[PDB]
From Swiss-Prot:
Family assignment from sequence similarity: Belongs to the glycosyl hydrolase 8 (cellulase D) family.
A Pfam family this chain is assigned to: Glyco_hydro_8
Reactions that this protein is recorded to catalyse: Hydrolysis of (1->4)-beta-D-xylose residues from the reducing end of oligosaccharides
Active site per the UniProt annotation: E65 (proton donor), N258 (proton acceptor)
Keyword Hydrolase attached: yes
Gene source species: Halalkalibacterium halodurans (strain ATCC BAA-125 / DSM 18197 / FERM 7344 / JCM 9153 / C-125)
Protein name: Reducing end xylose-releasing exo-oligoxylanase
Alphabetically ordered keywords of this record: Carbohydrate metabolism, Glycosidase, Hydrolase, Polysaccharide degradation, Xylan degradation
Function, as annotated: Hydrolyzes xylooligosaccharides with a degree of polymerization of greater than or equal to 3, releasing xylose from the reducing end. Only hydrolyzes the beta anomers of xylooligosaccharides, with inversion of anomeric configuration. Hydrolyzes the glucose and xylose-based trisaccharides where xylose is located at the -1 subsite, GXX, XXG and GXG. Does not hydrolyze xylan, chitosan, lichenan, curdlan or carboxymethylcellulose.
Consequence when changing D123A: Activity is 0.4% of wild type
Database matches in InterPro entries: 6-hairpin_glycosidase_sf, 6hp_glycosidase-like_sf, Glyco_hydro_8
Any Gene Ontology biological process: xylan catabolic process
Amino acid sequence: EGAFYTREYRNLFKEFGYSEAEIQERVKDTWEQLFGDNPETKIYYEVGDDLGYLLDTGNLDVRTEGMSYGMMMAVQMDRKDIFDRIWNWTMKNMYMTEGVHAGYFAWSCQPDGTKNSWGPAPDGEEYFALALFFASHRWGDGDEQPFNYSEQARKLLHTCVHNGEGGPGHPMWNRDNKLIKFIPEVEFSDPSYHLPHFYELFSLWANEEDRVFWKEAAEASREYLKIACHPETGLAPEYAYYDGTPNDEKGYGHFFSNSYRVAANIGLDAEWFGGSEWSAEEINKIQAFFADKEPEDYRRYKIDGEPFEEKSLHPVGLIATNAMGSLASVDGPYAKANVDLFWNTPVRTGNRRYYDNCLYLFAMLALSGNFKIWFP
Ligand code: NI
């Protein structure tokens, strides 16, 4: 039974023999390397007294993926100061009041706040919403907008479901199949965006008129991952059609950066809402696939496992996600090896560090029993 029910979170590092003191130290150190004055590893930058952002180092921009991640990290770490800095920057610079995506958040901005696009990225929105609910529950709603966290969350999820009913906009979920979309104007998806464990919580906390929908989306997403993951290797494509098969029209049909998150998501869903035979077997497949492969040699792979010449752009993120997946198969043949590999992998430095280090901190939180549900 999941932590949602027991309110006890598995400390998998501890269960696998790491000391409580060393785990505590490693979690704090990871946070400090990302959010403190450690220029080589840092991804969070403070602006003035009331702003802050996470920098996508690989593209020199600020993304809703990163900002929503940073808010989730901040609430998990009980850092309202950092949470509010990031959320303030997000509302000031990213929230759109004009155009077909009014009510959503521009997916990419320059560090100065200028929007690079008026298109949103749904995986940002869903992380903003849950981070905001958690903020409301840990700290209480603030008296001034936009710090009325729970209202902001419910408003945002309203738009995600209902956009287009009163205007030219489009929803971020397909209303018929209850699946999250890659972007509002397309009819295909991205397996890594599927967060059934978030949707379960939305089914308790969103506007009441959408609570049944959110339960249905949770179930739809669990079913969708079964068809999207390769049956032998467990590998999911970056983009996939609603039928579960890869969308490779622009090269996103393979196992690469986006896909890494699928294992992590399965891990966290198992911890929060309970294990399943499917999830255990799926993590066992991915870990089996990587068992005989060196991190230095990790590639892009077709989902059937065929390797490309191209190396993984984010091999540390791949390590972190595979290790976080162990929460879904704690007795799995490779579960300990994956957790140990992660323990022995430092936080990343250099221009490509942002994505790896985000996945890294999520894995550190989850594997130490510190990626929690914050209830009202
Ligand atoms: Ni120590």
